[PDB]
Paper text:
The basic helix–loop–helix PER-[name]-SIM (bHLH-[name]) proteins [name] and CLOCK heterodimerize to form the master transcription factor governing rhythmic gene expression. Our previous work explored the internal pockets located in the PASA and PASB domains of mammalian bHLH-[name] transcription factors, including [name]–CLOCK, finding that those domains could accommodate small molecules. In the present study, we focused on the [name] PASB domain (referred to as [name](PASB)) to identify a ligand and evaluate whether the pocket could be leveraged to modulate [name]–CLOCK transcriptional activities.
In the apo structure, the central cavity houses three water molecules that interact with each other and residues Tyr340, His344, Tyr404, Ser436 and Asn438. Comparison of the apo and CCM-bound structures reveals overall and locally induced changes. These movements include displacing His389 and shifting the position of the αF helix, where His389 is located. Induced repositioning of those and other amino acids by CCM expands the volume of the resident PASB pocket three-fold.
Author numbering: 336 to 441
The structure:
């Protein structure tokens, strides 16, 4: 359904993929999120633990589940999300290119 959407994030949080279900949940067009960092939208209280879970997943092929956190939507209010993250290691270049994130409304 449309209670979740999938994003991908480069190493500074930059959105590099946003599926169209994000607009239903966040009221942003995908193009508004693409090229901006997820950290720009996290509630400032949540930056620290989300950044540490992001750092964790860069060093493992296992998935990491965040705590619930608040995400600032287009009108400036906050919704609560929980994300499941895993990193995408290129098996030839041996580089983590991005992380995959399923973002679920709580």
């Amino acid at each position: 359904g449309s209670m979740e959407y999938v994003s991908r994030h480069a190493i500074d949080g930059k959105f590099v993929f946003v599926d169209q279900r994000a607009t239903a949940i966040l009221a942003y067009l995908p193009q508004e999120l693409l090229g901006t960092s997820c950290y720009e939208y996290f509630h400032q209280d949540d930056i620290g633990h989300l950044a540490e879970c992001h750092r964790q997943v860069l060093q493992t092929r296992e998935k990491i589940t965040t705590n619930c956190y608040k995400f600032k939507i287009k009108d400036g209010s906050f919704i609560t999300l929980r994300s499941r993250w895993f990193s995408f290691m290129n098996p030839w270049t041996k580089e983590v290119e991005y992380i995959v994130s399923t973002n679920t409304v709580v």
